[PDB]
Amino acid sequence: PPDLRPLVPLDGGRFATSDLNDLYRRVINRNNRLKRLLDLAAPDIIVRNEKRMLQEAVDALLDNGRRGRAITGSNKRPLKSLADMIKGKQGRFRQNLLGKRVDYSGRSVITVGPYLRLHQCGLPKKMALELFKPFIYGKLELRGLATTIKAAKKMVEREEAVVWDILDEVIREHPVLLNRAPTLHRLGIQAFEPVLIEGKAIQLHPLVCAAYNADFDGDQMAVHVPLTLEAQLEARALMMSTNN
């Protein structure tokens, strides 16, 4: 289908073309040439060469480089065939099925909060406001300070005091998942209760650092928001730092 091989606009008046489109065009051109040659009652050698070249084009489209030499693009490199986007580290299986990018997620450096408890972690106010935007919208709609989603968006972007009170109220007992980039074992991601702090750095408990194998020398950690009741209970009862 065309959408799976889109023709993205180049923003400069041109069109960026995928390798699959080039392979399909080559196959279609070869098929049309072979059809014309067959309809022209061509002799044996010419039609054999045309059929062989069509076979080579089909094999290149199905799996470039599997047999013979790969088809080179306009920038002197092998093209990406149908089999190339399935296998490998950049293939569909290992890039969009086993793992994928998620919403309601953030990333920031980690500092040390000596005053935090084992089940608590510091979170920036702006970062928490960005992460829990739909919850704030819902709470504002329920309370009655806003009548439409546009009004809630305007109130959130205006950063009113009522917005901050709602942000304080929503995450009173809403755990968040803190994870480090190298997740060697299950302890690399743990659930913590957020506490609003001033700044842009996540405050981490000193005791859990040995579990995270993290040092305060520029480390960056990601945070995810469990946005359903079952995930909230799972984080509270299984992945909480107190249970580990």
């Binding site: 994928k100 919403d103 450096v109 935007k133 299950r186 991601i189 359903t228």
Partner: protein, 1321 residues
């Protein structure tokens, strides 16, 4: 040694003791001189463009009737200056013009005498010129061509250490690697065979090559073997006995010479037996008949009676064969001498293996080997073999390659032809045979004598030669095809291939890299960098490990400390301070020659190969007067190892202790007290520091800051001595001295400082003047300090009062606690400049243009916009504001450029580029007006100087003539020329001076017109776009928790809390500390240099405090002079000598003014101050000698139980800001194909939940969380909408749905021809 004015401003105290015999060379020399060899005119054609032209030209045609030849080349005047190219986005380049002569021969005359000559000049593209600061300007951006460390051409012998054959046997290979051609290999087949391999294809026997070289079997056996003569005597066919052939073997038969039984049958021959045989002078010895069959006949023998070959060459003899030979009547035979270990029969076995028996068969086999699938033709095979290695065009060995080839083969001469020869191949094969036999040693790959450095010039020459041969092919085709009547040399050749290859090399090559402009140290390190990776080099994935290690030959050539950490470790290196490249490209280092036990001052540059032969002593060797070693046994490096040697055995000595380390490592004080890992990390981390609001000189330095600052182009260095006529924040005009004035020159030099210009890393580059009005200057003295530069000294960070103590856990692992006073003083505040571009391009619907009126915008939104449609200069802009108002026709939809969300700042510069032929907006007209005003002022300075001089001359002439000075004073200045004098020589010279005046005025007018034309020239843009608007925003970034801050000893951390000033610990005097550091990281990391630096900084600050106290009391100059003299004279036989008695009593006040903050101290890398000197310096001030004082808790106020280490430390702010790393996303854009959230902070993407996170979630047993993270949050579009609606409503429930990625995968597999679907049942 009388210090310069900039040095007299602030003299750094030097604690070094080793005298300096060689000053530090120019850091950016390797980049410069090499490029000079690429562009300088060379009468001898071996370097650069002249060499390439001589290699390619002259070019003939298919028929001998026309010829194109090259005469000379000239580089043109670049269209725009470096600053103009940088601001306009064009590439700084110079036109290349070449003299080409086309000679049409006389075809009618058989002798081919010249018939017609046509000489012309042809333009062959633009060659990108290289700036004085060792960098290139490509497309308006700064790029650096780093050097490449690659294997030198020549022959190399290696062997696998038993990896293959699965029994530990070593296989030997010999590779001939040319600069340009086909690589050759000779490998040992485990069955003891020789195999020749070309271009790493299938192996072939080497005897095939030998036969292809017109060598018969007899000649090969003569060359590769020794002959034993078996001559039939009157009886028992005694043979010419050679005792050396009897070593290491047992004689099965009794030998009989003269009647003495030296060796009997069945006893092993000992060395005593060999000696007895030698003493007996035995020449002939009896041989049994059966022993003959074991040997192999060497030369073919034919029977005269039957006219047939008795035997061919090289097969095992037989009893029937020897009987037939005896009946034939041949008295003597020749056999090949073989041995188990001394002389292996590898050549004979290889000759047996191959099927080829003649030169033609060998050539046919070689052609089939090289070009499979082609008809084997004798002429084609001969041509291919000749061109493979014996053609100058196809095969070429450089001078370095020929020298290495001759040296490896023990050839006396080092100069030879580039093409290969038969003798060279035979010698290589013989050397490989000898190595197999146990004589000789294999070469070392990592040896710096086997690896050479290729600079920008060599690669540029190679690319230009490739383009030149392409152009030569094109011109050959044109000459062959075109007529011989109206051909012009310009039309024959096309400059497109030359320009294309040049721009590809200078912009898209891996070695061509974006120059990092974080600080001058980063630029210096990047320019002085050698990368093994690149074309014709190692790959990062397959680089291996054994190459990454530090070879012993790296001493004084490659710094082991300064290497990148990560995947490319050991593959990228930093050149040493004194390292330089030889004429062949091999790295060499200076040394001091030692003669008769005394260390002379003569300096000899030794390479890796030459260093091994001699014995070199280490730099840290005690030396008394007359350069005599005070110790009988001195540690020295002889051959890849260090050992004790006698004083007379030494031959060379290291020039200085900084030879080993590079500039980055040499800039780290107390390196010898620091761990190697921490030193490496600190050296790599010093390059990432960002310039601060104010540059603070390092209290503890190494004395190399001045060299780095001067060598780098960030600072302004006076070209000629003189006085500062005019000083300003933007420009400096200096009236040069009369002695340095060129004839017919105004005598003023104008330096235009660069103020607030963005760098490659979005930082701020600003130059501030460092001299005052009327201050005399000299050549080489710094005028304006560049970024991260203080008074000509490198200033990467700031000096902070640090204290090593735990503080309520706020430090912990590596975190840093920072006082509020640091933020209040804006010590670490930085300026970041960001560029935003708006493009106005001609779409098919209608040409878009910048207008102030935008559809559906509020009036307040357009307040910042002017009538032209551009944001006002200096108007503060927050997120979402409109910078440039652009509208695209539909009637018009808004396309105005807006700042990204979360980006603030102040607009500081607006640049408009308009394609020629399009109307110019009034904003561009204003920009041009200010540019022309600045140019007019710059020209008018010189115009006024020259006019004043000329009018003074005419006034003097008129006073001498008619004596009318008073009338001139009363008369207007401009009406002095119109006055008429009496008819004499005075009138004639007055007319001449008037002519000179009007000529000068017209010359200045044409110069101004040329400048205006240059600045008003339309910019060249890409097709389809007619306007570009660039807006620069300046943002002040202040220190805050999460920012990464570090030091020079590898200690790093992040800010944890900006504590109040009252909470900091304070000493008895009440002064609080600024930085609190955890001591726990000192012993484990083994970085003790930071503690010594802290103590030295404390001593320096104590001295500075004493100086400040003296100054505040208005003490007399005598007391300050005495105190500063005592402070400078402190030390233990320091080499630095400072005399204040010759400072005119006025520069002492300036020095004390500069020393009030502190006393800078120079601590060499390995010849630094000892602990005793530090204690003495501390005792000089009113500070304890232990370095630890007693403080009190700021919050509580009781006494600290133990003294803590508090001092002054140079701390750097890294380029890792928390505001640039923090990101958060709830909902946003999604990918078109996979329907997944985007990636990256710039695209407002979401964090990726990788495989490891999924595994951790499964291990935790959480299933609902994993499903929510997998489908609803990322892929399920209906799930996404339902979740958003439910959360807005207030219900936290989720539907599983169907991820789109699985549907895409199923569709792809279906399109692969394989049917896949899900079954409901």
């Amino acid at each position: 040694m009388v210090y310069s004015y900039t040095e007299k401003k602030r003299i750094r105290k030097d604690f070094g003791k080793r005298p300096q015999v060689l000053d530090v060379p120019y850091l950016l020399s390797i980049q410069l001189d090499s490029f000079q060899k690429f562009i300088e005119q060379d009468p001898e054609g071996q370097y650069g463009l002249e060499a390439a032209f001589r290699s390619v030209f002259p070019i003939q045609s298919y028929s001998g009737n026309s010829e194109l030849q090259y005469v000379s080349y000239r580089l043109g005047e670049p269209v725009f200056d470096v600053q103009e190219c940088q601001i306009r986005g064009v590439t700084y380049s110079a036109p290349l013009r070449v003299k080409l002569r086309l000679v049409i021969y006389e075809r009618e005359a058989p002798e081919g005498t010249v018939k017609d000559i046509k000489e012309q000049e042809v333009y062959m593209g633009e060659i990108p010129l290289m700036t004085d600061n060792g960098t290139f300007v490509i497309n308006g951006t700064e790029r650096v061509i780093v050097s490449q460390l690659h294997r030198s051409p020549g022959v190399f012998f290696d062997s696998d250490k038993g990896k293959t054959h699965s029994s530990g046997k070593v296989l030997y290979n010999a590779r001939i690697i040319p600069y340009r051609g086909s690589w050759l290999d000779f490998e040992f087949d485990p069955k003891d065979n020789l195999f020749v391999r070309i271009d790493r294809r299938r192996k072939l026997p080497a005897t095939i090559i030998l036969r292809a070289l017109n060598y018969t079997t007899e000649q090969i056996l003569d060359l590769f073997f020794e002959k034993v003569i078996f001559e039939i005597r009157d009886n028992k066919l005694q043979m010419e006995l050679v005792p050396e052939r009897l070593r290491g073997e047992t004689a099965s038969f009794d030998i009989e010479a003269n009647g003495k039984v030296y060796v009997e049958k069945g006893r092993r021959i000992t060395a005593r037996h060999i000696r007895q045989l030698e003493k007996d002078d035995v020449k002939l010895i009896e041989v049994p008949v059966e022993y003959i069959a074991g040997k192999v006949v060497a030369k073919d023998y034919i029977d005269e009676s039957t006219g047939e070959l008795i035997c061919a060459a090289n097969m095992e003899l037989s009893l029937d064969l020897l009987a037939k030979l005896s009946q034939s009547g041949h008295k003597r035979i020749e056999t090949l001498f073989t041995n188990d270990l001394d002389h292996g029969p590898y050549i004979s076995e290889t000759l047996r293996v191959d099927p080829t028996n003649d030169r033609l068969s060998a050539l046919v086999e070689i052609y089939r080997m090289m070009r499979p699938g082609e008809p084997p033709t004798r002429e084609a095979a001969e041509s291919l073999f000749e061109n493979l290695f014996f053609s100058e065009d196809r095969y070429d060995l450089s001078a370095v390659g020929r020298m290495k080839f001759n040296r490896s083969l023990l050839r006396e001469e080092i100069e030879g032809s580039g093409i290969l020869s038969k003798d060279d191949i035979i010698d290589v094969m013989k050397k490989l045979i000898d190595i197999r036999n146990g004589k000789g040693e294999v070469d070392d790959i990592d040896h710096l004598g086997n690896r050479r450095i290729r600079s920008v010039g060599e690669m540029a020459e190679n690319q230009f030669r490739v383009g030149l041969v392409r152009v030569e092919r094109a011109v050959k085709e044109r000459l062959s095809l075109g007529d011989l009547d109206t051909l012009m040399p310009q039309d024959m050749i096309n400059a497109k291939p030359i320009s294309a290859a040049v721009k590809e090399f200078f912009g898209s090559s891996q070695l061509s890299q974006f120059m990092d402009q974080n600080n001058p140290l980063s630029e210096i390190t990047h320019k002085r960098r050698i990368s093994a990776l690149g074309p014709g080099g190692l790959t990062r994935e397959r680089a291996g490990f054994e190459v990454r290690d530090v070879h012993p030959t790296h001493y004084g050539r490659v710094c082991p400390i300064e290497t990148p950490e990560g995947p490319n470790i050991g593959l990228i290196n930093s050149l040493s301070v004194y390292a330089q490249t030889n004429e062949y490209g091999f790295l060499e280092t200076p040394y001091r020659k030692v003669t008769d036990g005394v260390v002379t001052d003569e300096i000899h540059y030794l390479s890796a190969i030459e260093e091994g032969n001699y014995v070199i002593a280490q730099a840290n060797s005690n030396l008394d007067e007359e350069g005599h070693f005070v110790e009988d046994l001195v540690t020295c490096r002889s051959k890849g190892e260090s050992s004790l040697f006698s004083r007379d055995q030494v031959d060379y000595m290291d020039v200085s202790t900084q030879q080993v380390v590079s500039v980055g490592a040499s800039l780290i004080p107390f390196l010898e007290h620091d761990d190697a890992n921490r030193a490496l990390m600190g050296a790599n981390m010093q390059r990432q520091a960002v310039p601060t609001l104010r540059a603070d000189k390092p209290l503890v330095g190494t004395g190399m800051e001045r060299a780095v600052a001067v060598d780098s182009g960030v600072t302004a260095v006076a070209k000629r001595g003189g006085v500062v006529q005019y000083v300003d924040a933007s420009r400096i005009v200096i009236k040069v001295n009369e002695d340095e004035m060129y004839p017919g020159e105004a005598g003023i030099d104008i330096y235009n400082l660069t103020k607030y210009t963005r760098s490659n890393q979005n930082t701020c580059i600003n130059q501030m003047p460092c001299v005052s009005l009327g201050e005399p200057v000299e050549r080489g003295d710094v005028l304006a300090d560049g970024p991260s530069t203080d008074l000509g000294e490198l200033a990467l960070g700031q000096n902070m009062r640090v204290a090593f103590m735990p503080w309520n856990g706020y430090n912990f692992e590596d975190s840093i606690l920072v006082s509020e006073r640091v933020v209040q003083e804006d010590r670490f505040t930085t300026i970041h400049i960001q560029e935003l571009a708006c493009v106005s391009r001609d779409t098919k619907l209608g040409p878009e243009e910048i207008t102030a009126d935008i559809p559906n915008v509020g009036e307040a939104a357009l307040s910042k916009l002017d009538e032209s449609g551009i944001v006002y200069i200096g108007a503060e802009v927050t997120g979402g504001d409109i910078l440039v108002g652009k509208v695209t026709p539909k009637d018009v939809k808004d396309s105005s450029l807006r700042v990204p969300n979360g980006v603030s700042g102040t607009v500081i510069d607006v640049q408009v580029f308009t394609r020629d032929g399009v109307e110019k907006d009034k904003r561009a007209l204003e920009i041009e007006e200010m540019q022309l005003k600045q140019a007019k002022k710059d020209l008018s300075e010189e115009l006024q100087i020259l006019e004043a001089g000329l009018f003074s001359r005419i006034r003097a002439v008129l006073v001498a003539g008619g004596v009318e000075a008073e009338k001139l004073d009363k008369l207007p200045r401009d009406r002095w020329l119109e006055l008429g004098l009496t008819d004499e020589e005075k009138q004639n010279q007055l007319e001449q001076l008037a002519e000179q005046y009007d000529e000068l005025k017209h010359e200045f007018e044409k110069k101004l017109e040329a400048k205006r034309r240059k600045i008003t020239q339309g910019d060249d843009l890409a097709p389809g776009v007619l306007k570009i608007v660039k807006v620069y925003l300046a943002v002040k970034r202040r220190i805050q928790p999460g920012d990464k801050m570090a030091g020079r000893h590898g200690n790093k951390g992040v800010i944890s809390k900006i504590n109040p000033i009252e909470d900091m610990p304070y000493d008895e005097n009440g002064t609080p500390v600024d930085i609190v550091l955890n001591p726990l990281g000192v012993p484990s990391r083994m970085n003790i240099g930071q503690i010594l630096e802290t103590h030295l900084g404390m001593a320096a600050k104590g001295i500075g405090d004493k100086i400040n106290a003296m100054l505040k009391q208005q003490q007399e100059v005598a007391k300050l002079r005495e105190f500063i003299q005592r402070a400078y004279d402190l030390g233990a036989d320091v080499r630095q000598k400072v005399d204040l008695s010759t400072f005119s009593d006025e520069e002492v006040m300036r020095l004390a003014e500069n020393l009030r903050k502190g006393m800078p101290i120079a601590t060499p890398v390995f010849d630094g101050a000892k602990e005793a000197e530090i204690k003495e310096l501390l005792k000089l001030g009113d500070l304890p000698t232990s370095g630890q004082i007693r403080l009190y808790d700021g919050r509580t106020g009781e006494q600290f139980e133990r003294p803590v280490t508090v001092g002054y430390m140079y701390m750097l702010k890294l380029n890792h800001l928390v505001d640039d790393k923090m990101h958060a996303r709830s909902t946003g854009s999604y990918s078109l194909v996979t329907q997944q959230p985007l990636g990256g902070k710039a695209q407002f993407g979401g964090q990726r939940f990788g495989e490891m996170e999924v595994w951790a979630l499964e291990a935790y047993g959480a299933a609902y969380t994993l499903q929510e993270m997998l489908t609803v949050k990322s892929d399920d579009v209906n799930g996404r909408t339902k979740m958003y609606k439910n959360i807005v409503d207030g219900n936290h429930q989720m539907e599983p749905g169907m991820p789109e990625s699985f549907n895409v995968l199923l569709k792809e597999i279906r399109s692969l021809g394989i049917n896949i679907e899900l079954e409901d049942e």
